[PDB]
Amino acid sequence: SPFSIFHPNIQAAKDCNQVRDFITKEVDSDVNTAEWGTFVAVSTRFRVYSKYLFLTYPQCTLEPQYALDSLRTLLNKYEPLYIAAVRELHEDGSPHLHVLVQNKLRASITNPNALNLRMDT
DNA sequence: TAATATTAC
Ligand SMILES: [Mn+2]
């Protein structure tokens, strides 16, 4: 529906490598992927406190590139280093997004709606 | 976890 607000599941990513593999798992992920930055080689009430975020926007028609661009700005204070946003389909064929964000600084997310996004149509 | 939802290492 027009001008829907999209709320993500926000998690601190436990293993960025596994998350990136997981969100690029589909054979056609290449044309459904937006990327920015350089991948960080990581060394091994609501609150998330991490440099590494794994976001899932269910039932979400946002273009990966525009989700990425807007998350870069919403997370700007934490100095994003790498973002990958990928569209996949639910079983019923409707789209959703997954995003991996790697920041320089640890983000303290206490508002669960902080990464909500509205689509411009 | 909240708070979208069946998608989420
Ligand atoms: Mn998926």
Numbering used by the authors: 1 to 44, 61 to 137
Provide the authors' own sentences about this structure as they appear in the paper.
HUH endonucleases are diverse enzymes that contain an eponymous motif consisting of a pair of conserved metal-coordinating histidine (H) separated by a bulky hydrophobic residue (U). Replication-initiating HUH endonucleases (Reps) are sequence-specific nucleases that cleave and rejoin single-stranded DNA (ssDNA) during rolling-circle replication. These enzymes initiate rolling-circle replication through sequence-specific processing of the viral single-stranded DNA (ssDNA) genome via cleavage and subsequent phosphotyrosine covalent linkage to the ssDNA’s newly exposed 5′ end.
The first cocrystal structures of viral Reps in complex with their specific substrates provided insight into their mechanisms of DNA recognition.
